């Protein structure tokens, strides 16, 4: 890494107003090393784990360097899933994600007449669309390569090369990736002239009780309520219907409680978060699904009412650092929890 000069402040890159409206709805990660670098029009290359931070960094640049009078930006992601989240996150500061569902003729009909705004997609789809001239390589001075390592190992090589040989030489090229094998190096070479090499790498008590009947779970949860009695806690159960079930069972038992399910759209979804920070909604019941948008930061307590069936999700639940994690287990769940204590040499102790 050759550029260690950082910009920690709120407002050094004298950002415009079409910008501080979204930051509202402390930039520290890769996002301060690269904060300004692009905002002019430089080619950069960062080695960073994609959390919600990395994929927020460049999202900013793109919208800053816009012109709302004219598509002018191109972002490539390893999957269609990651492409939509990007699109939301992006539109969430004021751009159209590429589906190839059975809905494509209305999609592209949409994209001929007046559509091209900003664009993000997989290398494969985006190419197809550039070719079929559905997408215009014209005034597109920004080229982002998100998670290149992943794009590459998914066999996206050709398409990435082809898509550039389709664009002007002037274009800004930013590549992001957690790792840098020889194929990733090779592209910086052939795509960029004189790059900024960044690197921000390397980037909690846990118990378990033993309810013997799975009906005892609601009960050992209202034990804990007396004995937690905080004005904040998040409860992870595994299914929408269980979320609803248990929410009812709480009112039943005169405990106020908050329910984040999944057919509650984003409109009134965020209704709670803001009030949950206030200590108003005492407890928050959720699936780790619509943890799509959640804040497990100001949450000093997390109850896994159901164990996550996937290790890697276990880490997305638990969340400076300061919080606790309580896990409920049943006599047929127990076989397979000591299994989580094998990818994790960090212990989970008896209650």
């Amino acid at each position: 890494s050759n550029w260690n000069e950082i910009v920690d402040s709120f407002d050094d890159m004298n950002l415009s107003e079409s910008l501080l409206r979204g930051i509202y709805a402390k930039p520290s990660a890769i996002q301060q090393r690269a904060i300004l670098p692009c905002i002019k029009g430089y080619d950069v290359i960062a080695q960073a784990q994609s959390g919600t931070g990395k994929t927020a960094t460049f999202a900013i640049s793109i919208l800053q360097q816009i012109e709302l009078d004219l598509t002018q930006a191109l972002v490539l992601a390893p999957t269609r899933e990651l492409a939509q989240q990007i699109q939301k996150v992006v539109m969430a500061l004021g751009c159209h994600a590429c589906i190839g569902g059975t809905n494509v003729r209305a999609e592209v009909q949409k994209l001929q007449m007046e559509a091209p705004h900003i664009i993000v997609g997989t290398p494969g789809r985006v190419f197809d669309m550039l070719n079929r001239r559905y997408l215009s390589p014209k005034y597109i001075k920004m080229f982002v390569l998100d998670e290149a390592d992943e794009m590459l190992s998914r066999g996206f090589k050709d398409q990435i090369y082809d898509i550039f040989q389709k664009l002007n030489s002037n274009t800004q090229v930013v590549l992001l990736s957690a790792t840098m094998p020889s194929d990733v190096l090779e592209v910086t070479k052939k795509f960029m002239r004189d790059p900024i090499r960044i690197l921000v790498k390397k980037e909690i008590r846990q118990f378990y009780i033993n309810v013997e009947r799975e009906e005892w779970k609601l009960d050992t949860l209202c034990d804990l309520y007396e004995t937690l009695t905080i004005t904040q806690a998040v409860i992870f159960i595994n299914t929408r219907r269980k979320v609803d079930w248990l929410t009812e069972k709480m009112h039943a038992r005169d405990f106020t409680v908050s329910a984040m399910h999944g057919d509650m759209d984003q409109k009134e979804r965020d209704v709670i978060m803001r009030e949950f920070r206030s200590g108003s909604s005492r407890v928050l019941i959720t699936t780790d699904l619509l943890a799509r948008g959640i804040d497990v930061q100001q949450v000093s307590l997390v109850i896994n009412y159901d164990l996550p069936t996937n290790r890697e999700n276990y880490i997305h639940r638990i969340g400076g650092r300061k919080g606790v994690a309580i896990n409920m287990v049943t006599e047929e769940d127990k076989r397979t929890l000591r299994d989580i204590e094998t990818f994790y040499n960090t212990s989970i102790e008896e209650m």
């Binding site: 190839g100 998914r154 057919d263 699936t287």
Partner: protein, 284 residues
């Protein structure tokens, strides 16, 4: 012959969904005394059908109320309904709980005034009426949403159904609960669109990393196959859709043709598609 008159009207409504046609029909009948009869019938019929009907019935009641009868009429009907619970609950085991949801919805929609439930205070020596009321109470407190019933039914948009089917699948990958998925699939009440289920579950495997999704979706389908929850036809049209769309899927998934084939093979292996269908799978 007042049940004979009214039942067809209501059942037909259940098919078409247009409460105006029901309203008019009733106006053109001049009931007066027996206005409060209608919501009793409708609810009874809905208690013996699926959620979608129950949804349709709440709605019919909202509309009927104002325009063809009063909340006074409505309130009588529910009084009747709770009088009846013991008999109803013989043909509809969860009738107390379900009437409690109609009640709860009917407050919500102000066709039952806001003191209906407390008007029952320290009265009942009917355990089931009281259970109806408790449910409605609890429901009403914690709604200080959109629908207590589902939102399945052939009356929904393919869009909405797609969003559910997606929900359902995304959910199973985190749950592991095949049974929860069978259930959600059933609540959509849309058995000629099950091919979407199949379709979207295969596309999930195609676009997935590792061996997990692979395994989980294959388990799901095997189970659905084994119980006949999904028909052979509907499974067939599901694969045939992927078969035909694997060019386009391949845009976003270079390796797609590779897993498709590996997956399709494991199906044939586990007994769930025929040779004909396995052999009709695109090669690279």
């Amino acid at each position: 012959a007042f049940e004979k008159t009214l039942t067809p009207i209501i059942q037909e409504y259940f098919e078409h969904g247009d409460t105006n046609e029901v309203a008019e029909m009733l106006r053109d009948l001049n009931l007066g005394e027996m206005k409060s009869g209608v919501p009793v019938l409708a609810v009874s019929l809905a208690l013996e059908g699926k959620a979608s009907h129950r949804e349709m019935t709440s709605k019919l009641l909202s509309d009927l109320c104002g325009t063809v009868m009063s909340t006074t009429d409505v309130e009588k009907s529910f009084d009747k309904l709770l009088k009846d619970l013991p008999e109803l609950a013989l043909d509809t085991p969860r009738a107390p709980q379900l009437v409690g949801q109609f009640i709860a919805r009917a407050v919500g929609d102000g066709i039952l005034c806001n003191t209906y439930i407390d008007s029952y205070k320290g009265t009942v020596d009917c355990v089931q009426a009281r259970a109806a009321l408790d449910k409605a109470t609890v429901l009403l407190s914690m709604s200080k949403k959109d629908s207590v019933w589902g939102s399945g039914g052939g009356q929904q948009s393919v869009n909405h159904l797609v969003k559910e089917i997606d929900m359902l699948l995304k959910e199973y990958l985190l749950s592991g609960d095949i049974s929860e998925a069978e259930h959600c699939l059933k609540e959509l009440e849309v058995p000629h669109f099950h091919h979407e289920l199949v379709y979207e579950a295969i596309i999930m495997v195609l676009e997935s990393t590792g061996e997990s999704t692979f395994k989980m979706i294959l388990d799901l389908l095997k189970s659905l196959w084994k119980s006949s929850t999904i028909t052979v036809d509907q499974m067939k049209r599901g694969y045939e859709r992927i078969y035909n769309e694997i060019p386009d899927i391949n845009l976003d998934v270079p390796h797609s043709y590779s897993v498709l084939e590996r997956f399709v093979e494991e199906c044939f292996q586990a007994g769930i598609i025929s040779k004909q269908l396995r052999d009709l799978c695109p090669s690279r």
